Amino acid sequence: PCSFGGVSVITPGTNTSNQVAVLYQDVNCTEVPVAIHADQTGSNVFQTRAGCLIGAEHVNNSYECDIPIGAGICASYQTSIIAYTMSLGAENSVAYSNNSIAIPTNFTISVTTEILPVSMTKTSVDCTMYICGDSTECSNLLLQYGSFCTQLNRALTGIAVEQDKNTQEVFAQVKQIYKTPPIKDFGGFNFSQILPDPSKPSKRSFIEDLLFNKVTLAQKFNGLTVLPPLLTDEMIAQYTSALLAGTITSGWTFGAGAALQIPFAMQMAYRFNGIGVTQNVLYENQKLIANQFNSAIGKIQDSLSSTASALGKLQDVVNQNAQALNTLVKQLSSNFGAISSVLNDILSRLDPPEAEVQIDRLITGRLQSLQTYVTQQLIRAAEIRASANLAATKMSECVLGQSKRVDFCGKGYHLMSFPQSAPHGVVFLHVTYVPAQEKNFTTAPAICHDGKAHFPREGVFVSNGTHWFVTQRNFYEPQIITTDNTFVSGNCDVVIGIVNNTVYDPLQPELDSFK
């Protein structure tokens, strides 16, 4: 078969430039600029595995991919349009030995936007007046087709209660409303971006006015209804405002049972124990936590300030639904071989002993179009709920308590979280624990003294060449090899790779305290 396929357009965006690029798909690039369907084409020709393309040049240098073409080839703008083999970041085999642990010293505490859709707009479609529109003899020919649209309502009412069941099962997983405390002195931790504020409409938060205006787009006319969601929009904040409260004030305990008093300045001490970091790192660096936590909450409005590229999934999920609504509307003006689209033109100038034959295919293709809208809703409806049940699960392990499954709530060691309201979703504030500024040390897996092995309770042994030390698996804080921090078992020589050092006994100067 002589070659044919789809042909597309690469653009860097409308207002950025007008240099374009044309991709031909799996055609050997010989008969290309000649035959047909060319909006003319140019000078350069380059061949890829995905076909050949016109409107760029191949560059031996590589960069981060932006625009997917195919086969590991991406395109961008330079002042011009080029194409290039993808990169994968910095190719660096970092160091390796058999006696070296890299331990971090300082650490940042960042945040990460992660947003999931939790719902969709409860559309609902009338049967009869979509098919005919308040007209008698058209509707009498509907009921001889049995019970098509009777189950279509129960399909769509079935999904109508479903997102109401989803919204119920994704926020109100506490039993009761909580009240934020009136005084605000939580160890310097400024929660002013995420708390509800009274000077707004009575329940709203500061992220919300930056968020409600950001998510925008038909209306009430023929053929459609838009039933409002079950839980009203104002109290959507009020559940979350309650959801802030205990995990601000009372801590993680209210997911289980009755709440408990605890101050937030020491809640992170339990949470620093959540990844195995001792409780001294809080109080010795409390103010250092504060500004970095302030700046992370500072930057989180700022990344979302002008136009982030991470609204995305929550913006189009209205939009692809909306054109799916809208493409149902264009089918009213379809014609299907009948000589009209409106019913009244058929009832104007035709013969009612035969005009139903023109109606006969007119009923089908409109109903045939309706079945397309049935499935297109239903498949994503399962796709939303299966995503939404994950979203409530992300509400579960990551808001009510401090989970352990890594890279499930924020990239990094999970400390805590903060849910915020959204138009049809949930926005979490995953607060991770990212360490940095490593200093590689001379390390050993075991210590022999007195022919007998020693193993730390948690952590490693490092030395700066001369003196050995003890610190934990994820943070640097050296201490003295003691008796209490280790235990004993076995002879020395059965284990390879052991170095030699004396072990301090605290009981011996206690033995030497009295003589």
Ligand X SMILES: *[C@@H]1O[C@H](CO)[C@@H](O)[C@H](O)[C@H]1NC(C)=O
Tell me the sheet residues that pair with 48: 51
Least distance between another protein and beta carbon 436 (Å): 6
Least distance between another protein and beta carbon 430 (Å): 13
Q: Which one of 32-40, 193-201, 296-304, 463-471 is the stretch in contact with another protein (CB under 8 A)?
A: 32-40
Nearer to another protein, 154 or 301 (CB): 154
Helix (H) or strand (E) holding 137: helix 136-143
Helix (H) or strand (E) holding 141: helix 136-143
User: The tokens of 467 are what?
Assistant: 């003196």
- φ, ψ for residue 140, nearest 5 deg: -70, -30
| Whether 204 contacts 241, CB under 8 Å | no
Total Cβ atoms within 10 A of residue 339: 11
Which spans of this chain sit near ligand X (rule: CB under 6 A)?
A: 15-16, 28, 60, 95, 98-99, 185, 190, 192, 307, 440, 464-467, 497
Total Cβ atoms within 10 A of residue 40: 6
190 contacts which partner out of another protein, ligand X, none, CB within 5 to 8 A by kind?
ligand X
Nearer to another protein, 301 or 458 (CB): 458
Nearer to ligand X, 60 or 489 (CB): 60
Per CB under 8 A, which of residues 442..501 are in contact with another protein? Answer: 443, 445-446, 453, 455, 458, 460, 473-474, 477, 487, 489-490, 494-497
Give residue numbers after which the chain breaks (C–N above 2.5 Å): 40, 79, 217
Per CB under 8 A, which of residues 295..324 are in contact with another protein? Answer: none
Nearer to another protein, 301 or 312 (CB): 312
Per CB under 8 A, which of residues 38..67 are in contact with another protein? Answer: 38-39, 49-50, 55, 66-67
Least distance between another protein and beta carbon 130 (Å): 10
CA-wise closest residue to 235 among 190, 168, 182: 168
User: The tokens of 487 are what?
Assistant: 């235990």
Least distance between ligand X and beta carbon 423 (Å): 20
| Whether 476 contacts 439, CB under 8 Å | yes
- Contact residue for another protein among 33, 57, 114, 187 (CB under 8 A): 187
464 contacts which partner out of another protein, ligand X, none, CB within 5 to 8 A by kind?
ligand X
- Helix, strand or coil for residue 435? strand
Least distance between ligand X and beta carbon 193 (Å): 7
Nearer to another protein, 76 or 193 (CB): 76
Nearer to ligand X, 46 or 148 (CB): 46
Nearer to another protein, 207 or 243 (CB): 243
Beta-carbon-side half-sphere exposure of residue 341 (alpha carbons within 13 Å): 8
Q: Which one of 5-13, 112-120, 198-206, 417-425 is the stretch in contact with another protein (CB under 8 A)?
A: 5-13
502 contacts which partner out of another protein, ligand X, none, CB within 5 to 8 A by kind?
none
Residue 440 binds to another protein (criterion: CB under 8 A): yes
The CA distance from 38 to 51, in Å, is 16
The CA distance from 509 to 67, in Å, is 69
Nearer to another protein, 90 or 301 (CB): 90
| Whether 365 contacts 336, CB under 8 Å | yes
Total Cβ atoms within 10 A of residue 389: 14
Nearer to another protein, 105 or 502 (CB): 105
Say which amino acid occupies 107.
F
- Contact residue for another protein among 29, 63, 72, 141 (CB under 8 A): 72
The CA distance from 299 to 315, in Å, is 22
- Helix, strand or coil for residue 32? coil
**In the complex, residue closest to ligand X by CB:** 497
